[PDB]
Design an enzyme around this catalytic site. Sequence first.
Site, short mmCIF file in Angstrom:
data_model
loop_
_atom_site.label_atom_id
_atom_site.label_comp_id
_atom_site.label_asym_id
_atom_site.label_seq_id
_atom_site.Cartn_x
_atom_site.Cartn_y
_atom_site.Cartn_z
N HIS A 32 0.92 -1.23 0.01
CA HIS A 32 0.00 -0.10 -0.09
C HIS A 32 0.77 1.16 -0.03
CE1 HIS A 32 -0.82 -2.83 3.46
NE2 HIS A 32 0.12 -2.39 3.91
N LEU A 98 7.40 -10.10 -10.65
CA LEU A 98 6.77 -10.48 -9.65
C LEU A 98 8.16 -11.03 -8.82
CD1 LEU A 98 4.20 -10.95 -7.76
CD2 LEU A 98 4.36 -13.15 -8.45
N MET A 99 8.19 -10.36 -7.37
CA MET A 99 9.26 -10.72 -6.48
C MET A 99 8.63 -11.45 -5.24
SD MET A 99 12.09 -9.49 -8.07
CE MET A 99 13.34 -9.43 -6.74
N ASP A 149 18.42 6.39 -2.31
CA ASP A 149 17.69 5.69 -1.28
C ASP A 149 17.94 4.23 -1.43
OD1 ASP A 149 16.61 5.65 0.95
OD2 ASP A 149 14.48 5.76 0.34
N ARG A 153 14.77 -1.65 2.89
CA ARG A 153 13.34 -1.75 2.44
C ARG A 153 13.12 -1.50 1.15
NH1 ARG A 153 14.82 2.78 4.38
NH2 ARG A 153 14.92 4.65 3.38
N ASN A 154 14.24 -1.05 0.13
CA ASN A 154 13.96 -0.88 -1.05
C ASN A 154 14.46 -1.98 -2.12
OD1 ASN A 154 12.80 1.73 -0.61
ND2 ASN A 154 14.73 2.78 -0.57
N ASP A 170 12.86 -0.53 -5.65
CA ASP A 170 12.03 0.58 -5.08
C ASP A 170 12.91 1.86 -5.33
OD1 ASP A 170 9.78 2.06 -4.64
OD2 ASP A 170 9.62 1.53 -2.63
C1 LIG Z 1 6.84 -4.82 -0.21
O1 LIG Z 1 5.68 -5.71 -0.38
C2 LIG Z 1 5.75 -6.69 -0.96
C3 LIG Z 1 6.17 -6.81 -2.24
C4 LIG Z 1 6.33 -8.09 -3.25
N1 LIG Z 1 6.72 -8.09 -4.44
C5 LIG Z 1 6.82 -7.33 -5.41
N2 LIG Z 1 7.37 -7.55 -6.34
C6 LIG Z 1 7.54 -6.61 -7.39
C7 LIG Z 1 7.46 -5.16 -7.30
C8 LIG Z 1 6.61 -4.95 -5.89
N3 LIG Z 1 6.44 -3.70 -5.47
C9 LIG Z 1 6.10 -3.11 -4.39
C10 LIG Z 1 6.99 -2.29 -3.61
C11 LIG Z 1 7.33 -1.25 -4.64
C12 LIG Z 1 7.96 -1.67 -6.06
C13 LIG Z 1 8.06 -0.56 -6.95
O2 LIG Z 1 7.12 0.30 -7.10
N4 LIG Z 1 9.32 -0.49 -7.33
C14 LIG Z 1 9.68 0.49 -8.42
C15 LIG Z 1 10.83 0.15 -9.13
C16 LIG Z 1 11.07 -1.09 -9.99
C17 LIG Z 1 11.91 -1.30 -10.43
C18 LIG Z 1 13.26 -0.83 -10.56
C19 LIG Z 1 13.16 0.64 -9.93
O3 LIG Z 1 14.18 1.43 -9.80
C20 LIG Z 1 15.29 1.17 -8.88
F1 LIG Z 1 15.91 -0.02 -9.27
F2 LIG Z 1 16.16 2.00 -9.24
F3 LIG Z 1 14.67 1.31 -7.83
C21 LIG Z 1 11.89 0.83 -9.20
C22 LIG Z 1 6.71 -2.64 -6.76
N5 LIG Z 1 6.51 -5.84 -5.14
C23 LIG Z 1 5.75 -9.22 -2.36
C24 LIG Z 1 5.53 -9.29 -1.01
O4 LIG Z 1 5.03 -10.62 -0.55
C25 LIG Z 1 5.62 -11.38 -1.17
C26 LIG Z 1 5.30 -8.01 -0.40
O5 LIG Z 1 4.84 -8.14 0.95
C27 LIG Z 1 3.44 -8.13 0.79
#
Ligand SMILES: COc1cc(Nc2nccc(N3CCC[C@H](C(=O)NCc4cccc(OC(F)(F)F)c4)C3)n2)cc(OC)c1OC
Length: 287
Positions: A32, A98-99, A149, A153-154, A170
């Site tokens: 969220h 998907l991670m 950052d 957490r990222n 992130d």
């Molecule tokens: C953190 O929450 C979870 C995420 C995931 N898995 C997940 N997989 C893929 C993406 C994702 N996101 C949630 C956290 C934010 C993320 C996002 O917006 N990332 C932006 C991004 C993506 C790729 C590259 C990037 O640039 C850089 F690398 F520079 F940061 C920046 C998208 N989350 C799984 C979970 O349970 C297994 C989680 O807990 C419930």
Amino acid sequence: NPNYSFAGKTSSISDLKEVPRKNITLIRGLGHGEVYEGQVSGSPLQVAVKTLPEVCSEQDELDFLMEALIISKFNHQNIVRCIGVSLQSLPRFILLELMAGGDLKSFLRETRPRPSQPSSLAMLDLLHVARDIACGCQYLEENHFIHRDIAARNCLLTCPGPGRVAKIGDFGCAMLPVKWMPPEAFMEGIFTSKTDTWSFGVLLWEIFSLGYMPYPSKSNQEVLEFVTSGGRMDPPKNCPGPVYRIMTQCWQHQPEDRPNFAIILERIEYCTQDPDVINTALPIEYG
Ligand SMILES: COc1cc(Nc2nccc(N3CCC[C@H](C(=O)NCc4cccc(OC(F)(F)F)c4)C3)n2)cc(OC)c1OC
């Protein structure tokens, strides 16, 4: 429509792989904006879907668009992939790798050795995570992109079990990540790749502490004054010297005295070869 430049090439909204809304299905929530597990049709490709609230400023839309471009131009195995986008339907989607293992911080906190699982994590697990993230950081330095950052957490994990691979996944005054920033970033507000070298050192600390907040008993301004006057965190519990020495080298006051990621990687490998390092037991947290 804004443009975005990276590795010398320029690209626009119209270069993004638009996937048809009908080929995408959401399965469940994750976090969220708001992010979902989902899948894309041609067996289905499993994805994470980041969405744009339909109630949003015109700036939010622009940031979402830009973010889509930025992520889509990265091409490295330790940076979460962009599968594509669905911008032409509302709500708008960015589609990502998907991670399954979640974020590194949370993972560390739930996998701290305890009496029930005393050898759930070994040093080599931590050195491999370290390595994975440094390798990604090295991609960003090579291509002149400053993250700003680099924190636990990222970073995300492909899976929880062994064979996990960690990746930068992130972007991340009261919101500024003060505890991850070098002196010259508050002072002059200037950023170079030696910025990320610093934050990586802090990431290292987080990894080897198994998920603790950096500078435990200290607020942002306290850490600022502490760091600014040359103060540094102690080694995390049971941390081997060679690994701590990587952290203290990442925290040199002088940017020029900090290593680039090639040197960080070299020193994470040496650690990975040393039996005194890798045979050290992680502390058991008492439940
Ligand atoms: C953190 O929450 C979870 C995420 C995931 N898995 C997940 N997989 C893929 C993406 C994702 N996101 C949630 C956290 C934010 C993320 C996002 O917006 N990332 C932006 C991004 C993506 C790729 C590259 C990037 O640039 C850089 F690398 F520079 F940061 C920046 C998208 N989350 C799984 C979970 O349970 C297994 C989680 O807990 C419930």
